[PDB]
From Swiss-Prot:
Domain SH2 stretches: 11-105
Organism: Bos taurus (Bovine)
Subunit field text: Heterodimer of a regulatory subunit PIK3R1 and a p110 catalytic subunit (PIK3CA, PIK3CB or PIK3CD). Interacts (via SH2 domains) with CCDC88A/GIV (tyrosine-phosphorylated form); the interaction enables recruitment of PIK3R1 to the EGFR receptor, enhancing PI3K activity and cell migration. Interacts with PIK3R2; the interaction is dissociated in an insulin-dependent manner. Interacts with XBP1; the interaction is direct and induces translocation of XBP1 into the nucleus in a ER stress- and/or insulin-dependent but PI3K-independent manner.
Disulfide bonds: none
Entire-sequence positions represented here: 614 to 724 of 724
Source superkingdom: Eukaryota
Family of the protein in this entry: Belongs to the PI3K p85 subunit family.
Record text about domains: The SH3 domain mediates the binding to CBLB.
Post-translational modification: Polyubiquitinated in T-cells by CBLB; which does not promote proteasomal degradation but impairs association with CD28 and CD3Z upon T-cell activation.
Record function comment: Binds to activated (phosphorylated) protein-Tyr kinases, through its SH2 domain, and acts as an adapter, mediating the association of the p110 catalytic unit to the plasma membrane. Necessary for the insulin-stimulated increase in glucose uptake and glycogen synthesis in insulin-sensitive tissues. Plays an important role in signaling in response to FGFR1, FGFR2, FGFR3, FGFR4, KITLG/SCF, KIT, PDGFRA and PDGFRB. Likewise, plays a role in ITGB2 signaling.
Protein name: Phosphatidylinositol 3-kinase regulatory subunit alpha
Length: 111
C-alpha cells in the first residue's frame, strides 16, 4: 500500500528530546530508526536501533553536505536518503551495524 516514507512524522521526531529518543529507540525492534534535529543547532541526525545497541547516526545539510553523499553517491533530498538508507546496510559503520532503516519510528502510529 502507501509507504509511510511520504509521512515526515513517521520518521521525523525532532521535537522528541535526546532522552525521549532513548525511550522511542528503546522497545523498538532492530531496523526501526528515527530522524531528529540537534534541537537548537541546524545540524541534523537520525538514530537507529540495532540488535546490539541504539545508535545516533549524524546527518548534515550544507551547500555541499547532507550526511550520506560521496562522489560515487550524492543524495539531493532527505526523502531519498530515508528510502535508500532502508536498502543500505549500516554495517559499514563501525563495521558492526548489521541493520537497515526498515520502518519509521512513528510508522505504526497514524493520525
Amino acid at each position: 500500500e502507501d509507504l509511510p516514507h511520504h509521512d515526515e512524522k513517521t520518521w521525523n521526531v525532532g521535537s522528541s528530546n535526546r532522552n525521549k529518543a532513548e525511550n522511542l529507540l528503546r522497545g523498538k525492534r532492530d531496523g526501526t530508526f528515527l530522524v531528529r534535529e540537534s534541537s537548537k543547532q541546524g545540524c541534523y541526525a537520525c538514530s537507529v536501533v540495532v540488535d546490539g545497541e541504539v545508535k545516533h547516526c549524524v546527518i548534515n545539510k550544507t551547500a555541499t553536505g547532507y550526511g550520506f553523499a560521496e562522489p560515487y553517491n550524492l543524495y539531493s533530498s532527505l526523502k531519498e536518503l530515508v528510502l535508500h538508507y532502508q536498502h543500505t546496510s549500516l554495517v559499514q559503520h563501525n563495521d558492526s551495524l548489521n541493520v537497515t532503516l526498515a520502518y519509521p519510528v512513528y510508522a505504526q502510529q497514524r493520525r
